[PDB]
Amino acid sequence: FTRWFMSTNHKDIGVLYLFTGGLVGLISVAFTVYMRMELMAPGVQFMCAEHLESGLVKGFFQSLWPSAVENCTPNGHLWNVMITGHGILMMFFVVIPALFGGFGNYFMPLHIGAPDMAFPRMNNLSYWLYVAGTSLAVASLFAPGGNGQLGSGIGWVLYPPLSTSESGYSTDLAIFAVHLSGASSILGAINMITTFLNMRAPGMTMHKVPLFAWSIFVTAWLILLALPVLAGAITMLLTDRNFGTTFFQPSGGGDPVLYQHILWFFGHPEVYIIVLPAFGIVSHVIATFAKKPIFGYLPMVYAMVAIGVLGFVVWAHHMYTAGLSLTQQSYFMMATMVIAVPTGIMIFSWIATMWGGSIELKTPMLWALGFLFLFTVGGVTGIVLSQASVDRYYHDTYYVVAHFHYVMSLGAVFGIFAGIYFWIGKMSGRQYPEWAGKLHFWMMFVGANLTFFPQHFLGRQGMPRRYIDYPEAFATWNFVSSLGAFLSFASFLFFLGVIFYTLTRGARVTANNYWNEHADTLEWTLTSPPPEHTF
Amino acid sequence: LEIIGRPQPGGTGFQPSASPVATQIHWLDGFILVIIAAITIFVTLLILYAVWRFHEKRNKVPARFTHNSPLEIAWTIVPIVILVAIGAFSLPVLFNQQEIPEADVTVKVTGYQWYWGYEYPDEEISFESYMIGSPATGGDNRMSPEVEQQLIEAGYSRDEFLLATDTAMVVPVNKTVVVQVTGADVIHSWTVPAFGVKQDAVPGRLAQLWFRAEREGIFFGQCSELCGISHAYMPITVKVVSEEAYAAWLEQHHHH
Numbered sequence: 001f002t003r004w005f006m007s008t009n010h011k012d013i014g015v016l017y018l019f020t021g022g023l024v025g026l027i028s029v030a031f032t033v034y035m036r037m038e039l040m041a042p043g044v045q046f047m048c049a050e051h052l053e054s055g056l057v058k059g060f061f062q063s064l065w066p067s068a069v070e071n072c073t074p075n076g077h078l079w080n081v082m083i084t085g086h087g088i089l090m091m092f093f094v095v096i097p098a099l100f101g102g103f104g105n106y107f108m109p110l111h112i113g114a115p116d117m118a119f120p121r122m123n124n125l126s127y128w129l130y131v132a133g134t135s136l137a138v139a140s141l142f143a144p145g146g147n148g149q150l151g152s153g154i155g156w157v158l159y160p161p162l163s164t165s166e167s168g169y170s171t172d173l174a175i176f177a178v179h180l181s182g183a184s185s186i187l188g189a190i191n192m193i194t195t196f197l198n199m200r201a202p203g204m205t206m207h208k209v210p211l212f213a214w215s216i217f218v219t220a221w222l223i224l225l226a227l228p229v230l231a232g233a234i235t236m237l238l239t240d241r242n243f244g245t246t247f248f249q250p251s252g253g254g255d256p257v258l259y260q261h262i263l264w265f266f267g268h269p270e271v272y273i274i275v276l277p278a279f280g281i282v283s284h285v286i287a288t289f290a291k292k293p294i295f296g297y298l299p300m301v302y303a304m305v306a307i308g309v310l311g312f313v314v315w316a317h318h319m320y321t322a323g324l325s326l327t328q329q330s331y332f333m334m335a336t337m338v339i340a341v342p343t344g345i346m347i348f349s350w351i352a353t354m355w356g357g358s359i360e361l362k363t364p365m366l367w368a369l370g371f372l373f374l375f376t377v378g379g380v381t382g383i384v385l386s387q388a389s390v391d392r393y394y395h396d397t398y399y400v401v402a403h404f405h406y407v408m409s410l411g412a413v414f415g416i417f418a419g420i421y422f423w424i425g426k427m428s429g430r431q432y433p434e435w436a437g438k439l440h441f442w443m444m445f446v447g448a449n450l451t452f453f454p455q456h457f458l459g460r461q462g463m464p465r466r467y468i469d470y471p472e473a474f475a476t477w478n479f480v481s482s483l484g485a486f487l488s489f490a491s492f493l494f495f496l497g498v499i500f501y502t503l504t505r506g507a508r509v510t511a512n513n514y515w516n517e518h519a520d521t522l523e524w525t526l527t528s529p530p531p532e533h534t535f
Numbered sequence: 536l537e538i539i540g541r542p543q544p545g546g547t548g549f550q551p552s553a554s555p556v557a558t559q560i561h562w563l564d565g566f567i568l569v570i571i572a573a574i575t576i577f578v579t580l581l582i583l584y585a586v587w588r589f590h591e592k593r594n595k596v597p598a599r600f601t602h603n604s605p606l607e608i609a610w611t612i613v614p615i616v617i618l619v620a621i622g623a624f625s626l627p628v629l630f631n632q633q634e635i636p637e638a639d640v641t642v643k644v645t646g647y648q649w650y651w652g653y654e655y656p657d658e659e660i661s662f663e664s665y666m667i668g669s670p671a672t673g674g675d676n677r678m679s680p681e682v683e684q685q686l687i688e689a690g691y692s693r694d695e696f697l698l699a700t701d702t703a704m705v706v707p708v709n710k711t712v713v714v715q716v717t718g719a720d721v722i723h724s725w726t727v728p729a730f731g732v733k734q735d736a737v738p739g740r741l742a743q744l745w746f747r748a749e750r751e752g753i754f755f756g757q758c759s760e761l762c763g764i765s766h767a768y769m770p771i772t773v774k775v776v777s778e779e780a781y782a783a784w785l786e787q788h789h790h791h
């Protein structure tokens with residue numbers, strides 16, 4: 001029934017987060033398909049001004065079919081709206097809601113032997129604020145916006161004066177959306193921290209807490225510091241747009257660069273809020289399927305804490321070309337390099353955890369190993385970008401896009417997939433079919449590499465970010481990238497098939513622990529699914 | 536003039552170098568590429584080896600260790616060594632890049648939605664640069680027979696569409712060109728891959744970059760900070776010519 005939505009139980013809320021995150025993921029992924037349809041070839045074939053003169057619905061379907069260049073007036077604003085929609089949905093309404101709100105709410109309490117979250121109704125509220133925020137973001141796409149069209153074509157980070165001068169009220173809706181999102185994450189963090197601190201089961205000591213619970217804990221702290229700052233940043237945009245302030249407008253004494261400092265002060269932490277829960281999931285998964293315990297438990301906790309705190313003093317590496325002094329450029333370069341040490345080290349610990357084990361190549365372990373390959377490919381590419389001298393060339397090119405899709409987008413996505421296959425049995429009492437999980441993995445892994453690796457070539461050749469159209473010479477690797485993205489999309493549709501199949505007619509789960517003895521955390525001592533009231 | 540600073544079909548490398556700064560970027564990136572390829576190969580081979588060597592079929596009883604002090608020391612120090620080695624080469628290059636020298640030539644560049652304004656204060660010259668194919672030249676940002684005709688007439692071909700502008704920033708070869716970059720409305724970013732330069736054009740701020748072109752030719756850049764509906768359509772063209780042809784160009788603008 002409706003009930004579901006009124007539940008206050010950490011298991012029910014985690015499930016709600018996972019499903020909603022998955023549907024929004026579907027929408028944002030669909031946006032990327034459309035993006036890749038347009039980037040597949042030079043010249044604009046899909047995003048034609050001519051489609052505006054039709055209705056919303058007829059205009060939609062016309063824009064999914066290619067036109068001859070001679071019949072297609074390039075509509076740059078639609079490109080910029082899609083890109084912004086894609087990025088905003090992913091960064092606020094997809095991966096954190098699924099990792100933190102989803103697996104966080106479900107499994108952190110079970111990991112620490114807590115009966116429920118400290119503030120159950122507050123947890124129900126956080127979900128509703130996420131949904132309200134999602135609604136406003138989606139709504140902004142249909143609201144009067146820039147250049148006398150719908151939607152905001154301003155990029156996920158909302159730089160002024162572009163963001164502050166975008167026509168209509170679409171941008172205001174998007175700001176509200178982000179407020180509601182931050183609120184959602186703030187409540188969630190309060191709840192995670194309080195629970196972690198006050199409600200550990202008798203015997204459960206900080207040094208005996210499972211890594212996933214740790215990763216959620218550290219993530220919750222970064223949220224408490226980072227999200228209020230973002231809320232400042234975006235209120236300042238709201239006041240410049242509606243209430244005559246001039247924080248970012250030079251004619252009133254403003255500096256647009258001020259916004260960047262404040263936004264990126266959130267913006268970096270944000271990328272660690274995304275992967276930390278994935279770090280948690282990868283640790284449990286590798287331990288389980290290597291049938292070994294976690295290598296260097298304590299150094300992992302410290303690495304996670306170090307990264308969490310150092311991620312607050314690196315922001316301006318997103319600003320090497322915004323007009324920072326040589327001294328600032330140099331400091332931030334070195335801070336960024338220091339944080340690269342405990343980050344890259346963790347690859348070694350996971351390999352060490354496999355080393356000497358008894359390795360079983362089941363689907364969750366595939367995702368975990370993929371995570372290790374992709375995280376590395378993304379990370380080394382961050383090394384390059386950290387050198388401001390070389391960032392001069394790469395900044396605002398497809399090389400940066402390749403970097404973050406490897407390290408951040410796919411890292412989170414492979415983490416999410418590892419978790420789902422690892423725990424669907426536990427959460428539902430039904431098991432996924434092994435061959436399909438493996439097939440999903442190979443399609444997704446081949447597809448994601450075809451999509452993003454060639455974007456490195458595009459960056460090197462100088463292809464800028466946020467372009468609806470590009471010079472002829474960028475054609476080849478854009479074409480390969482788009483084929484990879486279509487294959488990835490097929491892998492995901494197939495995955496939705498696999499999930500539908502699993503939940504409606506998957507093999508019945510019989511055991512508390514359907515893996516093995518080395519899946520040794522508390523959820524495996526409970527039934528599948530766990531009882532309504534646990535512990 | 537040869538078209539040098541542009542992308543090439545199927546390219547996987549940098550655009551040709553035309554400045555000493557570009558060359559340093561190519562060198563520092565190639566150096567780090569070797570390192571990061573080694574780290575990637577290393578990590579990949581370890582993963583593949585461990586999965587083969589320690590597969591459940593091949594190794595039936597799992598080890599139980601969770602420590603190895605010497606290895607954890609070595610595997611922390613080595614990454615720290617690698618980064619310091621990089622910085623040791625990186626910082627001088629950055630210093631060479633951001634320390635603005637004395638100008639032989641001074642151009643002041645202003646970004647607008649959606650075109651570039653150039654000004655040579657020492658010569659009292661100024662003009663605007665629009666993409667061939669934009670509304671300004673009668674187009675609407677797409678290829679057509681008209682746009683191709685206009686590209687030929689201007690010394691280009693249909694392959695330079697989206698890169699070619701109606702007017703170019705002309706500069707002399709082997710001279711220190713200092714460019715002052717600002718924005719008039721929103722943020723833009725002025726860049727020429729071949730010179731190894733990029734500076735955001737920020738309203739209320741005047742920022743400086745420098746280059747010295749080492750050979751004559753044509754070099755393109757594209758606006759590199761999302762700036763509205765025609766971000767994809769406000770490129771940069773720089774013609775590097777001899778000292779004589781530069782003067783000739785100067786005199787052609789002189790009002791008598």
Ligand code: HEA
Pocket residue numbers: 271272274275317318336337339340341343344345347348375376378379380381382383384385386387391394395396400403404407408409411574578614615617618
């Ligand atoms: C998952 C989140 C995540 C993570 C973990 C990282 C990791 C790193 N990031 Fe990336 N970054 C993003 C998400 C992330 N990044 C996003 C989203 C953006 C752009 C957002 C936007 O513009 O919209 C970005 C952009 C970005 C920039 C600015 C680019 C630009 O716009 O011009 C820079 C600059 O220094 C940078 C640097 C680094 C570095 C040095 C690392 C390092 O921490 C990585 C550590 C290295 C490895 C993991 C390699 C494997 C290492 C080993 C096996 C052993 C260790 C060896 C050595 C240290 C030598 N990143």
Ligand code: HEA
Pocket residue numbers: 018019021022025026029032033035036083084086087088090091094095098154155156157401405408409410412413416448451464465466467468485488489492
């Ligand atoms: C986690 C964040 C995330 C994720 C997952 C993705 C996924 C993808 N991205 Fe996205 N991307 C961003 C974050 C992300 N992106 C950001 C922040 C920007 C910048 C926006 C801006 O410029 O302002 C960007 C921009 C961006 C660009 C550059 C646009 C431009 O500059 O013009 C491109 C180009 O192709 C692209 C492509 C893709 C593709 C093909 C996919 C995918 O199709 C890849 C294939 C992956 C899948 C099919 C799996 C999807 C699964 C999930 C998302 C999990 C769902 C949840 C559950 C199942 C519980 N993205």
Ligand SMILES: CCCCCCCCCCO[C@@H]1O[C@H](CO)[C@@H](O[C@H]2O[C@H](CO)[C@@H](O)[C@H](O)[C@H]2O)[C@H](O)[C@H]1O
Pocket residue numbers: none
């Ligand atoms: C007592 C009165 C004093 C007499 C002097 C009159 C003052 C003129 C107002 C200046 O503001 C202009 O308004 C235009 C109208 O919006 C803008 O066009 C913008 O909007 C148009 C859409 O209406 C687009 O076609 C254009 O491309 C776009 O530049 C234009 O940029 C802006 O400078």
Ligand SMILES: CCCCCCCCCCO[C@@H]1O[C@H](CO)[C@@H](O[C@H]2O[C@H](CO)[C@@H](O)[C@H](O)[C@H]2O)[C@H](O)[C@H]1O
Pocket residue numbers: 348351352355581600601602603604606610
């Ligand atoms: C930067 C590259 C990173 C690569 C990471 C992958 C390599 C991991 C190698 C693991 O090293 C193992 O560590 C064990 C623990 O230190 C040693 O056991 C030794 O010590 C144990 C602990 O008491 C005993 O039980 C064993 O019998 C004894 O052989 C064992 O020989 C050694 O192979």
Ligand SMILES: CCCCCCCCCCO[C@@H]1O[C@H](CO)[C@@H](O[C@H]2O[C@H](CO)[C@@H](O)[C@H](O)[C@H]2O)[C@H](O)[C@H]1O
Pocket residue numbers: 648649650669670671765
């Ligand atoms: C004594 C008092 C003096 C009275 C003032 C005289 C009025 C002169 C009107 C000039 O207005 C121009 O109109 C262009 C066309 O409407 C705009 O182009 C804008 O719009 C184009 C077409 O949409 C784009 O292609 C361009 O890049 C973009 O600059 C341009 O900005 C704007 O300056």
Ligand SMILES: CCCCCCCCCCCCC
Pocket residue numbers: 064065066
């Ligand atoms: C002569 C026109 C070529 C045919 C191309 C077919 C386009 C198919 C696009 C459909 C994708 C929907 C998501």
Ligand SMILES: CCCCCCCCCCCCC
Pocket residue numbers: 377380381456457547548549568571572575
């Ligand atoms: C570890 C991934 C790095 C991706 C960079 C691709 C490098 C391609 C260099 C080819 C140069 C040809 C001239």
Ligand SMILES: CCCC[C@@H](O)[C@@H](O)CO
Pocket residue numbers: 657658659782783785786789
């Ligand atoms: C090369 C011709 C120089 C003419 C010079 O006086 C002008 O550029 C300045 O008005």
Ligand SMILES: [Ca+2]
Pocket residue numbers: 037038039040041042043044045046
């Ligand atoms: Ca196209």
Ligand SMILES: [Cu+]
Pocket residue numbers: 267268271314315317318
């Ligand atoms: Cu960052």
Ligand SMILES: [Cu+]
Pocket residue numbers: 646647649722723724758759760761762765766769
């Ligand atoms: Cu621009």
Ligand SMILES: [Cu+]
Pocket residue numbers: 722723724758759760761762763765766767
């Ligand atoms: Cu731009």
Ligand SMILES: [Mg+2]
Pocket residue numbers: 321395396724735759760
């Ligand atoms: Mg930029």
